[PDB]
Design an enzyme around this catalytic site. Structure first.
Site, PDB file in Angstrom:
ATOM      1  N   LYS A  50       0.836  -1.196   0.000  1.00  0.00           N
ATOM      2  CA  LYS A  50       0.000   0.000   0.000  1.00  0.00           C
ATOM      3  C   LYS A  50       0.875   1.251   0.000  1.00  0.00           C
ATOM      4  O   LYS A  50       1.852   1.336   0.754  1.00  0.00           O
ATOM      5  CB  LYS A  50      -0.952   0.009   1.192  1.00  0.00           C
ATOM      6  CG  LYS A  50      -2.114   0.975   1.017  1.00  0.00           C
ATOM      7  CD  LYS A  50      -3.111   0.776   2.110  1.00  0.00           C
ATOM      8  CE  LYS A  50      -4.240   1.787   2.057  1.00  0.00           C
ATOM      9  NZ  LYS A  50      -5.494   1.151   2.556  1.00  0.00           N
ATOM     10  N   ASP A 154     -14.803   0.138   9.860  1.00  0.00           N
ATOM     11  CA  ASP A 154     -15.004   0.133   8.407  1.00  0.00           C
ATOM     12  C   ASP A 154     -15.185  -1.306   7.928  1.00  0.00           C
ATOM     13  O   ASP A 154     -14.681  -1.711   6.877  1.00  0.00           O
ATOM     14  CB  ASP A 154     -13.819   0.799   7.707  1.00  0.00           C
ATOM     15  CG  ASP A 154     -14.120   1.287   6.269  1.00  0.00           C
ATOM     16  OD1 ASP A 154     -15.294   1.343   5.821  1.00  0.00           O
ATOM     17  OD2 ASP A 154     -13.129   1.654   5.582  1.00  0.00           O
ATOM     18  N   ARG A 158     -16.222  -5.259   0.901  1.00  0.00           N
ATOM     19  CA  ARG A 158     -15.115  -4.729   0.113  1.00  0.00           C
ATOM     20  C   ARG A 158     -13.837  -4.599   0.927  1.00  0.00           C
ATOM     21  O   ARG A 158     -12.760  -4.434   0.336  1.00  0.00           O
ATOM     22  CB  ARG A 158     -15.477  -3.363  -0.470  1.00  0.00           C
ATOM     23  CG  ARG A 158     -15.335  -2.235   0.570  1.00  0.00           C
ATOM     24  CD  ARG A 158     -15.809  -0.849   0.099  1.00  0.00           C
ATOM     25  NE  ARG A 158     -16.411  -0.194   1.256  1.00  0.00           N
ATOM     26  CZ  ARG A 158     -17.692  -0.303   1.582  1.00  0.00           C
ATOM     27  NH1 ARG A 158     -18.520  -1.006   0.803  1.00  0.00           N
ATOM     28  NH2 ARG A 158     -18.133   0.296   2.684  1.00  0.00           N
ATOM     29  N   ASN A 159     -13.922  -4.617   2.258  1.00  0.00           N
ATOM     30  CA  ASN A 159     -12.735  -4.581   3.109  1.00  0.00           C
ATOM     31  C   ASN A 159     -12.388  -5.940   3.703  1.00  0.00           C
ATOM     32  O   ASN A 159     -11.670  -6.005   4.711  1.00  0.00           O
ATOM     33  CB  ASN A 159     -12.914  -3.572   4.238  1.00  0.00           C
ATOM     34  CG  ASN A 159     -12.857  -2.170   3.756  1.00  0.00           C
ATOM     35  OD1 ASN A 159     -12.112  -1.856   2.821  1.00  0.00           O
ATOM     36  ND2 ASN A 159     -13.671  -1.308   4.358  1.00  0.00           N
ATOM     37  N   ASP A 172      -7.993  -3.399   5.544  1.00  0.00           N
ATOM     38  CA  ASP A 172      -8.190  -1.955   5.523  1.00  0.00           C
ATOM     39  C   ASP A 172      -8.444  -1.414   6.924  1.00  0.00           C
ATOM     40  O   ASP A 172      -9.587  -1.156   7.326  1.00  0.00           O
ATOM     41  CB  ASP A 172      -9.332  -1.569   4.576  1.00  0.00           C
ATOM     42  CG  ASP A 172      -9.321  -0.068   4.208  1.00  0.00           C
ATOM     43  OD1 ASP A 172      -8.316   0.658   4.513  1.00  0.00           O
ATOM     44  OD2 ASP A 172     -10.331   0.379   3.604  1.00  0.00           O
TER      45      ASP A 172
END
Ligand SMILES: Nc1ncnc2c1ncn2[C@@H]1O[C@H](COP(=O)(O)OP(=O)(O)CP(=O)(O)O)[C@@H](O)[C@H]1O
Ligand SMILES: [Mg+2]
Length: 282
Positions: A50, A154, A158-159, A172
């Site tokens: 990242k 979060d 998608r995470n 994430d």
């Protein structure tokens, strides 16, 4: 930018590859890391890196730093994407994490949908047991996070990442902590949205939405309801309907995660207990 020698990894041993994912705080790139895994110090390891985008802001760099430090605190667990190292000196900041080859969970599930509902993998169509197993793994990961005093904030399909062994990995940690204005509204508990409070029981609320995402095989929460109109409907006691491929037993679990009174939602421990029972009778 100060160095942490326990985590620092030599830039010359890192070879960057294809993009894997990007947003508006950074990007993720596939890479090869020679010797990063000190259980096998000779071996090249496929990793994810990242990093900032070319149009990054100072806050983006600050946020990436915070994410790296949060992942140092979290520790290692089967169902959590783990930090492998970092490049912080003499170059761009690289945060090196474990590679999940089957992408994020939402997107693993959508490609494994049954017929009639470019990326499809019909050979690996999801069974009902795969879905509860998915949920059990993620409940295990959240139980561990809470045991380490960490709120994710979060949690969403998608995470979540899926490895080549179909192991779910919570990822994430950019919003994680020990306003709430930066949290995706459709995943948030009302006390987080309204009262600016976040506990492990708010994460339990998000887990319920995640459950719904899973049993819709990657559907979008509160479909047809704009974020702007969701505030009112939650305060009036609205909740999502049962997905077709969801048992009523598992639907009541979602609804327990969505109780208006936070102390009344299940704990991640109890959710792990319950899911282990359900998984045993499939
Ligand atoms: N370790 C990994 N292995 C494989 N793919 C990964 C990965 N980590 C992330 N990805 C891919 O990149 C996507 C985005 O990842 P991530 O959630 O960490 O970034 P992000 O949401 O903070 C971007 P932004 O904040 O800029 O919008 C993931 O959904 C996933 O598809
Ligand atoms: Mg994300």
């Amino acid at each position: 930018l100060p160095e942490d020698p326990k985590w620092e990894f030599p830039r010359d041993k890192l070879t960057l590859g294809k993009p894997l994912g990007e947003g508006a705080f950074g990007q993720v790139v596939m890479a090869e890391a020679v010797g990063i895994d000190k259980d096998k110090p000779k071996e090249a390891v496929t990793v994810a890196v990242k990093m900032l985008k070319d149009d990054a802001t100072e806050k983006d760099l600050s946020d990436l730093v915070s994410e790296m430090e949060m992942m140092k605190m979290i520790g290692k667990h089967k169902n959590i994407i783990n930090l492998l190292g970092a490049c912080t000196q003499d170059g761009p900041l690289y945060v090196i994490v474990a590679y999940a080859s089957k992408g994020n969970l939402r997107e693993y599930l959508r490609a494994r949908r049954p017929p009639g509902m470019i990326n499809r993998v019909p050979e690996e169509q999801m069974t009902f047991k795969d879905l509860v197993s998915c949920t059990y793994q993620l409940a295990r990961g959240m139980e561990y996070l809470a045991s380490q005093k960490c709120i994710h904030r979060d949690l969403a399909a998608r995470n979540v990442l899926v490895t080549e062994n179909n192991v779910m990995k919570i990822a994430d940690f950019g919003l994680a902590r020990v306003t709430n204005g930066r949290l995706p509204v459709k995943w948030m508990a009302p006390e987080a949205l309204f009262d600016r409070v976040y506990t492990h029981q708010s994460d339990v609320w998000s887990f319920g939405v995640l459950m719904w995402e899973i049993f819709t095989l990657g559907g979008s929460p509160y479909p047809g309801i704009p974020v702007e109109e969701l505030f009112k409907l939650l305060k009036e006691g609205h909740r999502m309907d049962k997905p077709a491929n969801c048992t009523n037993e598992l639907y009541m679990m979602m609804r327990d995660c969505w109780h208006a009174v936070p102390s009344q939602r299940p704990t991640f421990k109890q959710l792990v207990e319950d899911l282990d029972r359900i998984l045993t009778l499939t």
